[model samples]
Target: MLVISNNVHLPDAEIELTAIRAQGAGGQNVNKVSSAMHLRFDINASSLPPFYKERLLALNDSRITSDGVIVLKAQQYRTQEQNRADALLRLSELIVNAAKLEHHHHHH
Candidate 1:
């Protein structure tokens, strides 16, 4: 289960996690092992609350593509396990931010 906030929880089915080859640097081992993480979440077709979906789709985040899919790449960690955790953590963080009720202040 992925917990976004105190009351928001998402299931594993809605989240797509993939292990890809980490790019750049390192020796021969880096070329053979897939240590990087790729996370994809679709806001439009998720089981998230209606308001959460609306907020996520409206966010100005570059990670969120035009089709309402959030694509996050995590390669900071050397091991696939660590990278996977890192990606999940980041996804949770993004959801948490999206759950917030942002009040835009406009000056006329």
Candidate 2:
């Protein structure tokens, strides 16, 4: 489980992680090993609170789809484990940051 806060936590079942080959030129090992990590999470299908869901769906990030799904690619690291960790971290950060933007309550 990924804990975003004391009240918000994401279960592993809601997150999908896949291993794929990294793009661009790299060493021979890059061709043979699937080190990149692909993550997908559906905002509408998650157990997050309604506030979180609304905030996330309202985000202008390219990673979020029209269907309310978030897709993340992590390949900065050479190992699958590192990429996997990076993916989860990014996911949490996305949610946290989106929620933090609620300070702007003025009508615009």
Candidate 3:
């Protein structure tokens, strides 16, 4: 079981990971190995406070839906390890982006 610690600005317990077979190349390996990771983090359920959620939802991200659910997909690497790292990095980036955005409603 891989434990992905949360970012410095975000709570660790708020993030969750669900492993599934990745789509696209790798032939037989793709079908046999669960290379893809569906990283799920709900702003509504997170400890980031309501202001962050409101701002995040208002921002336009291709992965984010109208429902405010953040969905990210990364499968550039052939190995599961690389793919997993990529996914984590992406998640961290998302948090960082949110943190840096102009917040008229929230002080922090």
Candidate 4:
């Protein structure tokens, strides 16, 4: 399982990975093999509880479509493995952003 935090987690089985040929220059290698990794995570179907689901849906990210599907494109690296790790880090960053809370200092 790919954990976001102690309670928040996403199973590896839940993520759908598809490899498609990436555009641009890489010569014959790029034309023959798929170096791009396309990941799709369903916000409504993951192991996340209702609160996280709501929070994820509320995100106005370019990767998050209006239908609540989180799309990730990793092509920065030439290899799929590197891009996959990068994608996970990117998602983790998003989780961190959402998890951080500003307390009510005025109440203190």
lDDT of 1 by residue, 1-108 (tens): 777657877778888888775466346655566667788887766778888777777776778777788898787888879988888778777766765647321211
Q: 38-106, model 3: which lDDT tens digit per residue?
A: 677776676665666776787656676677667775556766677768878886666567668774324
lDDT of each: 0.74, 0.78, 0.64, 0.69
In model 4, where do residues sit more than 4 Å from their true spots?
22-31, 101-108
Model 4 quality (TM-score): 0.74
Q: If both were scored by TM-score, which would come out higher, candidate 1 or candidate 3?
A: 1
Count backbone overlaps in model 3: 0
**Comparing 2 and 3 by TM-score, which wins?**
2
If the candidates were sorted by their lDDT against the true structure, best first, what order would they fall in? Answer: 2, 1, 4, 3
Better of 1 and 2 by lDDT: 2
lDDT of 2 by residue, 1-108 (tens): 878779888888987888775455357544566567888898878888888888877776778787788887787898979988888888887787777765432322
Candidate that scores best on TM-score: 2
Summarize candidate 4's per-residue lDDT along 18-101 as a digit string, tens digits. Answer: 665646745755455566777787776777787766666666556666666678888788888888888778777765555453
TM-score attained by model 3? 0.64
lDDT (C-alpha) at residue 6 in model 2: 94
Q: What is the TM-score of each candidate against the true structure?
A: 0.75, 0.78, 0.64, 0.74
